[model samples]
Target: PRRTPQSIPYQDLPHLVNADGQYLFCRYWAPTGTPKALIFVSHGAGEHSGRYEELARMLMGLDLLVFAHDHVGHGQSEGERMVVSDFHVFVRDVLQHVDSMQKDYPGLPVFLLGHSMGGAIAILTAAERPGHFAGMVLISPLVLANPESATTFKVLAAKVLNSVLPNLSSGPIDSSVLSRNKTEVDIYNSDPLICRAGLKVCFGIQLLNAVSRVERALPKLTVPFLLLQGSADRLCDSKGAYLLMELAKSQDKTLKIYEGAYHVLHKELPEVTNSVFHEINMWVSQRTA
Candidate 1:
């Protein structure tokens, strides 16, 4: 079964119905020659795999295949829109896709590239099953839920509501804070596949619990990883990213910070993303060798 490049439309890229039979959408950017590595992408909360076309094309040009999927509760997957029973469900979905990729490309130096919420899920998944991936990459993972507002009482409130009305929307994550690129923000606001619902109380509780689990699991997170974050990201605390570097007992961990970028550092204007992309590919290459 031959696959199309990122040049083709996403609907035409590829598809896999996972074990649960939810439409697990996936796209592969194939290499012209031998692939240096394979990047498995777990996208953030609202966005889908389609938004990564341009970045996928650029990375594919470097002869590394990129595989990305829309998580179950959002973006073309069949589920209660913008809702999940638990955040670890997203992690299971990621590993299912990875299992598919492993069978598809045996023995490739597979890397996990998680963005935003996806980053936390990736870290959790990696912690669950270490020594499976060659490396890991986290782009501004939600290690802390708006550190300014994540007080203990507020967190407990979310948990209480979660125990009662889990599906109720607590509030929306401001998409405007995603990037400085106005057009990108506009596209995000207008995207039909993207979820506009605010984070639910249950989901919010899960987020805090997940972040704590990742931090506590840091000692067991021995996988080589690269954590990239923005100094000025409003949605998450950059300090959490640094803290992972300090605590995670990985021998080959790296952390890089951008001066004044927003949450979506990879989606920032090319001056930022271009360098970010290059730096990531270089690190992957360096470790793969």
Candidate 2:
């Protein structure tokens, strides 16, 4: 007898067990005909892969097989809420999942898509195995820590607090920053799978680790990538997106900045969201062609 995710019965859902013996809940959107390529999505912290359904469906129109899984500690996945031994665990699991999918869809080009913290995971994963990815698409990636939250004094406070109270609550994310669309924000706020509790001190530390790791990965990144950022995002700084554009050595990199958009560009107002989908569809379409 093994453990099951709380949201759905283990036998009822598609899933894979990681090296750590954790069951990661999975989702896949396949087109009717033969697929052109593969896209593995890495979702942001405290959010589940299910939130990516809308985006996946849009990619399916491009004849791409889109797949994703809830990270070990989030959504319906197995683990304590928002906790991991190291950020590399995420990169490792992503690589494992992608490898497994590649086996099934042999010979197809693979692409990586990540948002926020997932962007950090994607960067490290691509760096680990250079030339594996045909391209990458990142939205509001967490390359640099938000200056407001990671100031010298606050970071020092967090470091000291982690040793004594690793499980201490940091603070809940403000849903308002997720999107400008009231309906989208409302949907996110009401999602049952999303972790509403303040992120733990331990998880926050891992995020800091991810930022540092991504910084190292960027210089070596050669995979063509699309970087999308919202100018007004308060969670991940726009400066980080600019830094990624300037730092990555990829000759085929492109960055798109959405004026006045929030952190979650895909869930923002219709115009912004539509533009994001169009850009991604066009970007991947050209490469896979």
Question: Clashes in candidate 1: how many?
Answer: 2
lDDT of 1 at 223: 84
Candidate 2 per-residue lDDT, tens place, 1-289, comes to 4545464677788888999999888899999999999999999998989888988998888999999999989897899888899888899999999999999999999999999999989999999998889999999999986797767435654565855634445478888877999999999999988988886766787888888888888899999999999999988999999999999989899999999999999999999999999999899889987
> Each prediction's TM-score against the native?
0.87, 0.95
- lDDT values, one for every candidate: 0.77, 0.89
Q: Which ten residues in a row are the worst by lDDT in model 2?
A: 162-171
Give Cα distance to truth, residue 37, candidate 1, Å. Answer: 2.0
lDDT of 1: 0.77
In model 2, the Cα lDDT at residue 87 comes to 84
Question: Which residues of candidate 1, in runs, are more than 4 Å off?
Answer: 1-13, 152-169
Q: Which numbered prediction scores highest in TM-score against the true structure? A: 2
Give per-residue CA lDDT, model 1, range 67-152, as digits (tens). 88788777766666666777778888888888877787888878888888888888888888877778888889877666666774
